C-alpha cells in the first residue's frame, strides 16, 4: 500500500530547461531543491538563487527578483561576492539526483535560473519540495 504523499509533501517545478518559474514558500516552514540531468554534460553549469516579495498592485503576485545573500556557516569559507550559488559538477551521471537547500528564508517567494542560457543549460531539471504546512 502506498499513500497520497503529495498531500503532505508537494513539489513544484522551478526550472524546466527553458523557463524559470517563481515558487511560493509562504505556507511551508521547510523546503529544498532537487536536481537531475537528462543527457551527458559538456561542462559545469552554475545557477543563481533569487527571492521575491509581494508586489505593489496585488498581494498575491511576486515582485522583481532579489538576489539571495550568503550566510557563512559555523566556520568555513565565504563566497567571493557574498551571494549564494549552486554549481552542478560535470561528472554527474544521468541516473542520479542531487539535493541541497539554502539556510535562510528571506522573501516569501523563491526562484532559480542558470547564469547563462545555452545548449548545456537545457540538460538540467530543478524541482522544489515543501514540508510542514502551517495553515
Amino acid at each position: 500500500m502506498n499513500f497520497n504523499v503529495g498531500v503532505d509533501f508537494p513539489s513544484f517545478i522551478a526550472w524546466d530547461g527553458t523557463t524559470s518559474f517563481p515558487v511560493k514558500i509562504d505556507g511551508f516552514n521547510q523546503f529544498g531543491f532537487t536536481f537531475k540531468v537528462i543527457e551527458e554534460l559538456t561542462a559545469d553549469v552554475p545557477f543563481n538563487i533569487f527571492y521575491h516579495e509581494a508586489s505593489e498592485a496585488d498581494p498575491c503576485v511576486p515582485g522583481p527578483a532579489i538576489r539571495v545573500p550568503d550566510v557563512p556557516f559555523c566556520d568555513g569559507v565565504a563566497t567571493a561576492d557574498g551571494l549564494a550559488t549552486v554549481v552542478i559538477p560535470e561528472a554527474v551521471a544521468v541516473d542520479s539526483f542531487c539535493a541541497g537547500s539554502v539556510p535562510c528564508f528571506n522573501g516569501p517567494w523563491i526562484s532559480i535560473a542558470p547564469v547563462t542560457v545555452n545548449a548545456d543549460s537545457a540538460k538540467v531539471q530543478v524541482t522544489v519540495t515543501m514540508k510542514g504546512a502551517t495553515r
Binding site: 536536481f35 569559507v77 563566497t79 549564494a84 550559488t85 549552486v86 554549481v87 552542478i88 554527474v92 551521471a93 541516473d95 542520479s96 539526483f97 542531487c98 539535493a99 541541497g100 537547500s101 539554502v102
Partner: peptide, 27 residues
C-alpha cells in the same frame, strides 16, 4: 556555495571473469 548530496538511482551489474593458471610449460 551550497554543497549537494548525491547518490545514484540504478544498479549496474558486474560480470568479472575468473582466471586460473593455464598449466605448466618448460619455460
Amino acid at each position: 556555495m551550497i554543497k549537494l548530496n548525491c547518490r545514484p538511482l540504478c544498479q549496474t551489474p558486474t560480470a568479472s571473469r575468473l582466471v586460473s593458471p593455464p598449466c605448466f610449460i618448460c619455460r
